[PDB]
Amino acid sequence: PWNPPTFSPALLVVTEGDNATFTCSFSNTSESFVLNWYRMSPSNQTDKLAAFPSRFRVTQLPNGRDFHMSVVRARRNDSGTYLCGAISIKESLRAELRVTERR
């Protein structure tokens, strides 16, 4: 897969109720792409959470290369595997979210 987006960091750990913000990095060579944030489910399925251009939000950053993929008010069951994907599907590598129990 040539020039896929990256997604950082590899692991984000927060307590339930907190926000978590990943960064999808993608410099298109092609013009007109869409950038999707996805969740991987048990048997390797994907589900789409948000997109460029709900608790899940994508924002392009001022450098244009970068995109915050934000979760607001994380729940426990938000824990899991996430990635980003560009369409000029070129998939980023996977990262993880873990949402801890607030005692």
Epitope: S8, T100, E101
Partner: antibody, heavy 120, light 109 residues
């Protein structure tokens, strides 16, 4: 080829300060948080806190709320554990460690430990 | 904090025997977030089992883990001489992270 390299052992008087380093080899420094722990001689493991070089977020255990500062220097891919106002009780091997993909909170890679002895 | 309590703190058994170590959590833990370490003297702990029952990379299959809720166990089916060590459980369900007090495995004679 991941390895965490820690600073050498330190003998300290009560009231002094230690700064232990944890330098990361063999991966993108910002991808994983660094966890700090300690284990007094023949005891058991106690969590201190963590630093995520991604976003400079820290989590501390209430025990060490104030007395420990975790800081970073990304240039050198090092996280530092500074412990102030040392007690005899802080005599321990201090470990840094990190997770890997899908360890769900298991620590895959550990520093070699830094023995910090506090005594009058 | 969610205190972890291991039983017993020292156990005795022979090369070739089986042993079972217990880790009881003071509150219930999602099983994905409970893990086991082995520590030989002088050396750092090493991950053995993650998420209750999965062997870590390069861990022999004489090692296995089980349990849920508050009650987890670790089983070595076929003690080798290299396996006399201390074993620790750990939880990543809540902050603060907690570790059990340790079970030290000794050579019956």
């Amino acid at each position: 080829q991941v390895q965490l390299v820690q600073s050498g052992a330190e003998v300290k008087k009560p009231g002094a300060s230690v700064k232990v380093s944890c330098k990361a080899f063999g991966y993108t420094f910002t991808t994983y948080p660094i966890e700090w722990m300690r284990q007094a001689p023949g005891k058991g493991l106690e969590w201190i806190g963590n630093f995520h070089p991604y976003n400079d977020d820290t989590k501390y255990n209430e025990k060490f709320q104030g007395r420990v500062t975790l800081t970073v220097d990304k240039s050198s891919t090092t996280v530092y554990m500074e412990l102030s106002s040392l007690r005899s009780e802080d005599t321990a091997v201090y470990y840094c460690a990190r997770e890997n993909y899908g360890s769900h909170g298991g620590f895959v890679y550990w520093g070699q430990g830094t023995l910090v002895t506090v005594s009058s | 904090e969610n205190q972890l309590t291991q039983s017993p703190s020292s156990l005795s058994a022979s090369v070739g025997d089986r042993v079972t170590i217990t880790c009881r959590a003071s509150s219930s833990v999602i099983s994905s977030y409970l893990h086991w370490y082995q520590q030989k003297p002088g050396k750092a702990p090493k991950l053995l089992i993650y998420s209750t029952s999965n062997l870590a990379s390069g861990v022999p299959s004489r090692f296995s883990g089980s349990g849920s809720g508050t009650d987890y166990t670790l089983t070595i089916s076929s003690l080798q001489p290299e396996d006399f060590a201390t074993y620790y459980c750990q939880q990543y369900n809540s902050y603060p992270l907690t570790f059990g007090g340790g079970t030290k495995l000794e050579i019956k004679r």
